[PDB]
Amino acid sequence: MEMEKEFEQIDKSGSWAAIYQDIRHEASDFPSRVAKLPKNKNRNRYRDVSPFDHSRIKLHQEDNDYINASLIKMEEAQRSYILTQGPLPNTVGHFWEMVWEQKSRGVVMLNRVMEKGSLKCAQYWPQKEEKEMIFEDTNLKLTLISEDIKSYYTVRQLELENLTTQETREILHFHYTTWPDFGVPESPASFLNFLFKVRESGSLSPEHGPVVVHCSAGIGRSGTFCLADTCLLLMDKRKDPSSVDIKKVLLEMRKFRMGLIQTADQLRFSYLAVIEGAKFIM
Numbered sequence: 001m002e003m004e005k006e007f008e009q010i011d012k013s014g015s016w017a018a019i020y021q022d023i024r025h026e027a028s029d030f031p032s033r034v035a036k037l038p039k040n041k042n043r044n045r046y047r048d049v050s051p052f053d054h055s056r057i058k059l060h061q062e063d064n065d066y067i068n069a070s071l072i073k074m075e076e077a078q079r080s081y082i083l084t085q086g087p088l089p090n091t092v093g094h095f096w097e098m099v100w101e102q103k104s105r106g107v108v109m110l111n112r113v114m115e116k117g118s119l120k121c122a123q124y125w126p127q128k129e130e131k132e133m134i135f136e137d138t139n140l141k142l143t144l145i146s147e148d149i150k151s152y153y154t155v156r157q158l159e160l161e162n163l164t165t166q167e168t169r170e171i172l173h174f175h176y177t178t179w180p181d182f183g184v185p186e187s188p189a190s191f192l193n194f195l196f197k198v199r200e201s202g203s204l205s206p207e208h209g210p211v212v213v214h215c216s217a218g219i220g221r222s223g224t225f226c227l228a229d230t231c232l233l234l235m236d237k238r239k240d241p242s243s244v245d246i247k248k249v250l251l252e253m254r255k256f257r258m259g260l261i262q263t264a265d266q267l268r269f270s271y272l273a274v275i276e277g278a279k280f281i282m
């Protein structure tokens, strides 16, 4: 079926939970043996969110190459993404090592450091220009260059220096700061505006490594971001845009990382965002 009228049909019939459970039943199951090794327990935020072995990002290190991160490669759309968990106190150095090694330009953050009165990820970037951060385990330095605070999000320019080689690179940090503590946003308009800002920066483009996108677990809000981006790109590429099937795209993405889209409300919100974004395109 088309998207906008499939949508009304699920609203009127109140069957979003049944649609979402079908997805969960059909989703791929692949091994995640490296994630579950005992030496990697303190590298995982949640015991039930792990990268598949076949798509995990490897750190370029001979001691321990593990990080909870997955490469989502979308072949028809010609977009790739790295989805990862919010860094832990003992993995902040690994996080920036990955950014360096994978040649990423942009980092997309979809959570606040504290939500619901608990810590959802580490404070892994500097807050003041004059107070830079040094990660000694991976030999990197990170400096805040500038910061632009808007009503729904904040953009930061960062400098990442590899202290072994004295090379430097400019990283863009795109921080969506207004996703509610419970549920999903009432309108997709600010989330779509945010996506377009990321696009406009070049951070999604083939001349760079894959964007790094995270929330707390790196599957819910993160899955919403890449699912919408990919669907909109396909609607621009194809002769028949009504042939884009959001459930089929989601299942393709779940071949690369488990659990993408965590609730039926996130599924419905993803539909809404794609429907509204297609118009604005023309």
Ligand SMILES: c1cnc(Oc2ccc(-c3cc[nH]n3)cc2)nc1
Residues within 6 Å of the ligand: 089, 090, 092, 093, 119, 121, 122, 123, 124, 133, 134, 135
């Ligand atoms: C340079 C300096 N310090 C570090 O390590 C840590 C950084 C932040 C936290 C933290 C505290 C509450 N939320 N996040 C923990 C450890 N890494 C590089």
